[PDB]
Design a protein around this ligand. Sequence first.
Ligand code: ADP
Ligand code: ADP
Ligand code: GLU
Ligand code: MG
Ligand code: MG
Ligand code: MG
Ligand code: MG
Lengths: 443, 443
Amino acid sequence: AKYTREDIEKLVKEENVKYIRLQFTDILGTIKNVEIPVSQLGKALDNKVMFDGSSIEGFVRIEESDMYLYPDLNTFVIFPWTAEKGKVARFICDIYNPDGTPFEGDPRNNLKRILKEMEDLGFSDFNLGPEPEFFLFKLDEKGEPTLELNDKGGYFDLAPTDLGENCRRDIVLELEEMGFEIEASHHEVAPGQHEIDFKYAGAVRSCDDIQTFKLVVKTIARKHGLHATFMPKPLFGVNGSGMHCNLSLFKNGVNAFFDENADLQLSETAKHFIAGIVKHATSFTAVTNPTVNSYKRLVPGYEAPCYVAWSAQNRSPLIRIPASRGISTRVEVRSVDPAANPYLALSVLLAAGLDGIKNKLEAPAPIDRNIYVMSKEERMENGIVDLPATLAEALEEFKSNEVMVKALGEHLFEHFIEAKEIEWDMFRTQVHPWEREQYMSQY
Amino acid sequence: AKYTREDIEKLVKEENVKYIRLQFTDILGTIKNVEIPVSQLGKALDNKVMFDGSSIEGFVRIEESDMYLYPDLNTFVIFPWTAEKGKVARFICDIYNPDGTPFEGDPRNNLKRILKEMEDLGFSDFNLGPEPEFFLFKLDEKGEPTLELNDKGGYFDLAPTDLGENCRRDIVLELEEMGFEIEASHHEVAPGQHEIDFKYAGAVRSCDDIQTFKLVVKTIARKHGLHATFMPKPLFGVNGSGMHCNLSLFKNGVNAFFDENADLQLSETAKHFIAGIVKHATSFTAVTNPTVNSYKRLVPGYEAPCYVAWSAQNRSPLIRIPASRGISTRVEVRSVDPAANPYLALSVLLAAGLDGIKNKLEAPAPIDRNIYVMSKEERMENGIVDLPATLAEALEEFKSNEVMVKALGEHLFEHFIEAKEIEWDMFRTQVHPWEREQYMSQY
Ligand SMILES: Nc1ncnc2c1ncn2[C@@H]1O[C@H](COP(=O)(O)OP(=O)(O)O)[C@@H](O)[C@H]1O
Ligand SMILES: Nc1ncnc2c1ncn2[C@@H]1O[C@H](COP(=O)(O)OP(=O)(O)O)[C@@H](O)[C@H]1O
Ligand SMILES: N[C@@H](CCC(=O)O)C(=O)O
Ligand SMILES: [Mg+2]
Ligand SMILES: [Mg+2]
Ligand SMILES: [Mg+2]
Ligand SMILES: [Mg+2]
């Protein structure tokens, strides 16, 4: 819909595009990209460009399998940042096997398929409002990220005034030319920590503005002599950077979670959906939380989720439901972090949503009383189960779950476990400066 | 054709050329040149320019011998980089003895002399689609290369973002203006390592294209305060730059390798061509990888062609056949590194393919099973040899080969070895820090 191949080949001629960055996204969620000169647009829009597909596998690839790049014309974007010989153009593309089939291991197809299956139960959209938090660090002469922050502000503070840096201001001003839709942005809890929340949109267009985001950020910050990072827990002792995820289901252009009469204004749809997120939470974390590091943030203390349960408005509840109902009816999942793969976070979250409406799952009693406060005893009296505390735990959990391990397929899943099992392997064989300074002299 | 003498004389007035590089390659692929004021354009065009042809031998030159420079008007080009007075231009020249005979020593001639052979056998064009890789290092105070890589990218990543340096993108753009037809380009397996892939072209059109590239690269990389090097493996235990060579024998303007009526769709020629490439493989490695360092890359692990054979998809096969087909039926030779002299690379690759064709050689069992994953004797099961492991080894083989020699000719072969038996000597007589690190206290 959004664009047509005639609008494009006209626009590239108009704007003077001279470079085409045909971007995609590997499995760890990194921003892959094979770039061609503009002279090579025809071949591109024909869906002919071949690139080594084994890349989608990341550092755990072995042999090269040629694959094709099918661009999505409704993702075209002309970067503000000029090159000395014209401007640069982007194109988000799906990966296809050599023959004709889509490559099953492509996180973007994988979300189309699970989304296909969403409409197999009759729902129209699956909309997303992400609240992705990031940090700004200074740089030394050498282009080397230090560990000093661009400021010393706190929650909702006035970040660097409009006379200077304001990386966040200028970051948001550059995205809006780009035809973005940002809700608002505020300084977050820790010095140097910032946030830019998004106006919600269908999953796919959402998981694509979630990548684009990260890129314009790491771009714009660099420009001002900074380093920007979505690492969940950069600095021990300070706030972590979590990327919440406001989720809503539509049917027939209408929000399904809302129900005037029923309890809380939540239909059996909204109610059942929940129950499955809860069943499957502990499991699917290993995806919404890919790294060794995240679990340093998911340590009780800094208003991070550490417990499976949902509230009216609790301290740090794992599943909130924001004040607003009706159409803005939404379930907040506040445990995802900007290291998550957006395609594989929405593929899996979508999963436990439909696994709960399918088998009509019984939403358990919502804990309204401070979940932290409870001793380590009454913690069980309400069946409030903690989450996995180390990437390993998270992976044995998910490794087992029949449902999660279907919402990824046999390719996407089998690989993932390996990269992460390698990753963990590196963390646990390592000897950090801690071990050494806690042990060398005491023992 | 491309350019009549009348044609060129036009553009050098109009475009205000004030300098001219009569450019040619020495025996080791180094780009040489004798430069002249534009005031001296008539003299070169009339082929009367004399220079010392002994320079072609490199460092192994002894006696000073006068020689002639004949430019290929089809290689005229202006460089999009102006000097204080005017522009600078150039030609790729062929070298002739004081009596209008070609110099048996010029690498560009010996590729003509060997492409001639292809016509005696009955073919029309021998196409080439190089995939040359390269590293960018930082520059210290003095303007000297350091060991700092230009970025931290990885396989098919978004290499430097479009905001800041971006050497890669800037080299793709620049080369577009220079009538260069670039296919694509990505970020390569190691940090600071890059690839820019070529559209297939005749042998010598491409080799002219491969040299010029190296020049443009180093030239722009310098401009961004970087150091672009084409070293097969400038860093131990870091992936090394290579340069696969996609080859495809044409006849009657048609890909003589395709044929739905054969195994895997490979004409009886494609089969024969592979037969001879394999016959000669251990022998021509002393030329496609012409440095004491080339072989510190041919160590198993960081993905490289240690072993000899041809399959559908494997960890790093010597010969490959990409998905693509039809006119796009080619024989990728994955062991060539960017250390090879184009004209002498092809001289030996061509010969082998022609020895297989001409001599109805039979292509062996394409080892479709992964080879890396086999033991020295479990690998001996099949007819699988690794290549030379030192330049010493690679040269003794090369010499003992009748066809290879007859593929470079008296002069080249002679000087080539001479020079290469010196490098080994310089290197086996050296005493490296490793040797000290290891033995000085051990013993
Ligand atoms: N139906 C929905 N689905 C997903 N996200 C939503 C939905 N409605 C709102 N959001 C998200 O909630 C945040 C604010 O939305 P808004 O509708 O203004 O909430 P409120 O009614 O509480 O003011 C945004 O970050 C947005 O992305
Ligand atoms: N006929 C040919 N002979 C030699 N090399 C070729 C030929 N056709 C393509 N190549 C090379 O193979 C590489 C892969 O290109 P690709 O886009 O897959 O080709 P195609 O679209 O023709 O199948 C390129 O770097 C290109 O230079
Ligand atoms: N020379 C390496 C290059 C690595 C790469 O480009 O993937 C190879 O032959 O595989
Ligand atoms: Mg927040
Ligand atoms: Mg919030
Ligand atoms: Mg490559
Ligand atoms: Mg290749």
